[PDB]
Structure formats: structure tokens, C-alpha cells
């Protein structure tokens, strides 16, 4: 047991410590208003159920693009085994709209031990609650 990952029954893996997830998406191979493309490791790629993309304006208001309890998975592994987080996917076929270089473009990750299979006692489906983990956050002009 890595003691780092938070195992469970069947003695599998369903999530590590934040500092562990952060370290994987630590290396970004490419970022654009269409999606990331970092290099995520299979050991982690497993515990994650999806990502959450949001645009935080200079003042302080944050908009979640794929704001949905089930649109959470916008990731997908390729040929060269590189993960491409697809912003454009759940933003109705449109890429990210940044109207000001200083708006940040946060992208969170959700360990499976936090993922919600369905709504709640509020008939709510928002990405609030879902304990997310930031993994990337470059301003607007740092993106390009």
C-alpha cells in the first residue's frame, strides 16, 4: 500500500492525497482555449473520474463550463498515451471564450471517491460540493 493513495475494499485505489494529483498534471504539454493536453500517469489516470473547467474573472466571479454532476469526464487518452482534457466538449461545441487576458482558466480534477453517481435531496446537479482538486490554472494571456 502506497499509504499515499486512499484504497478501500477489494483493496483497490479510489484517490490519493491532493499533493499527489497536483504533481501529475504538474507537466503541461499544451494548453489552448480548446483544452489541455498534459501528460497524466496511468497510476493516477485511474483514480480520477473527471475534470471541472471554470473561468474566474478578475473581480472574483467563477463560471463552471461543464457545470454538471455528470459532464465531469472531458478527459480522454490518446495513441502516445497523452491525456487531452476537452473544454470544447460540453460547452456546446464551442471552445472557451476568454474576454480579458487576466481571467484565469482553472481546471479541477475529481478523485472517484468524491464523484457523485446521481443528484441529492435538492434535486441538485451542480459541481458545487463535489470535492474538486485544482490541477491547472493559467491566466488568459498565459494560455493562448
Amino acid at each position, epitope marked *: 500500500r502506497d499509504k499515499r493513495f486512499h484504497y478501500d475494499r477489494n483493496n483497490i485505489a479510489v484517490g490519493a492525497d491532493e499533493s499527489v494529483v497536483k504533481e501529475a498534471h504538474r507537466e503541461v504539454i499544451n494548453s489552448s482555449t480548446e483544452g489541455l493536453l498534459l501528460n497524466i500517469d496511468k497510476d493516477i489516470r485511474k483514480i480520477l473520474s473527471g475534470y471541472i473547467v471554470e473561468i474566474e474573472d478578475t*473581480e472574483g*466571479l467563477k463560471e463552471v463550463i461543464n457545470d454538471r454532476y455528470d459532464m465531469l469526464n472531458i478527459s480522454s487518452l490518446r495513441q502516445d498515451g497523452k491525456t487531452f482534457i476537452d473544454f470544447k466538449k460540453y*460547452n*456546446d*461545441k*464551442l*471552445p472557451l471564450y476568454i474576454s480579458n487576458p487576466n481571467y484565469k482558466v482553472n481546471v479541477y480534477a475529481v478523485t472517484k471517491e468524491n464523484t457523485i453517481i446521481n443528484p441529492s435531496e435538492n434535486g441538485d446537479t*451542480s459541481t458545487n460540493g463535489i470535492k474538486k482538486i485544482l490541477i491547472f490554472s493559467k491566466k488568459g494571456y498565459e494560455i493562448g
Partner: single-chain antibody
Amino acid sequence: KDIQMTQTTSSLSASLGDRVTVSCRASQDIRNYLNWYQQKPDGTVKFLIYYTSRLQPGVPSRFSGSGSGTDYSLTINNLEQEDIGTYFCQQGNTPPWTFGGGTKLEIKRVQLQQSGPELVKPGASVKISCKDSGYAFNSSWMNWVKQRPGQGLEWIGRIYPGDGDSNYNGKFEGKAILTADKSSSTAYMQLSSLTSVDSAVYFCARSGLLRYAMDYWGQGTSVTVSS
């Protein structure tokens, strides 16, 4: 149902240099997904603020949106002759999108080219045409909004030229038929079987970059219907 937007103050006048305030008011937490548009005097339509307070580039710093929950409001610090117009506030949380009723502001004392005005005999179809001239046609949606006095604005539907997917409104399920032609950047609506009811204007606002906001609007198309 349709999230019903309410603009209690239907109209107002105010000298220049005044701090005008236009207030919208949703019928259920729309969670910030609200935008404001200004309808100039020249029957045109400008996209101003999206997502409650983010200003569209170009808008003069003296504007500003506010709120959260079900009480959003535009505030025009020290008014200026070129701000006159009728402001609407379309929500954009849970489709179908629905606009307010407009708060006509007075003064107390062409990338999207639409078709020509139609005139039909009660019971005939028509085909209005939105002719985008820009470059982002098959890469940006196309919403068709319907304006008629007293009825703020009703979102009809939209199609995405680039592939063919489309969405409609419940009241217009059986009326409009959105068709588009990727080769000549053009959309077409087809109000089939008209009535004295359809007699209205029909703008064709294209929503590109912002699924819940139409940035460029056509000019309109007076589709009046006789007896």
C-alpha cells in the same frame, strides 16, 4: 417550465448625466447565467454583458451588471445620449432561454444580413434568411429570436451549420423549421402556416463563443400578416 424573466419597470426617461438602473428579476435562481442586451433606436440589437457582470469588449466602462440569485440589474453611471434604447435581459441557465420585457430608456427633455420584409396571406409559409458574411459560420451556432410589441423576446431555436444539430422551443416546435446552408453561410427559418399571431419581427442572433448568449443580431424582418 420556462424560467420566466420579469422586468417590472417597463419604461423610463432621464436627463443626461443620470445614473440609470434597469432591473431584471428571474423566477428561480439562475445562478448568474444572465446577460443584458441593448436595443438601439435603429431597431438593432447589441450584446452588452454576459454572465451577470462580465462586460462585452467595447462596452463603455460606465456600464456594469450586478446580482446573483434572482435579482440582477444593469446600472448606467452618468448617462449619455448614445445609451438610449430598450434594454432586455435574457437569462441563460436552463433553456429555453427567455428574455425580459425591456425597459425602454428615453430622454426627459453588418456581418449578419437578414432578408426582406414579408407580407403573407393568413395560412401561407415563408422563408426568412440570415446571411452571415463573417468567417465563423459553420463554427458558431445560430439562434432565431422573435420580437413583437409587448412580448419582450422569445427564443425560437437554433441550428449549428457546421454539422446540423438543432434545438427548438416548445411553443415553436410546430411552426419554425430551421435549415442552413454551409456553402453560402446562411440560415433560414420557415414559419409554416402563419396566423395573425405570427405577425412580428424576427431577428436571427448568432451565438458564437458563449452557448447561452447571442452576440450579433440581424436587422429584422417585418413578417406582417393580413386578413
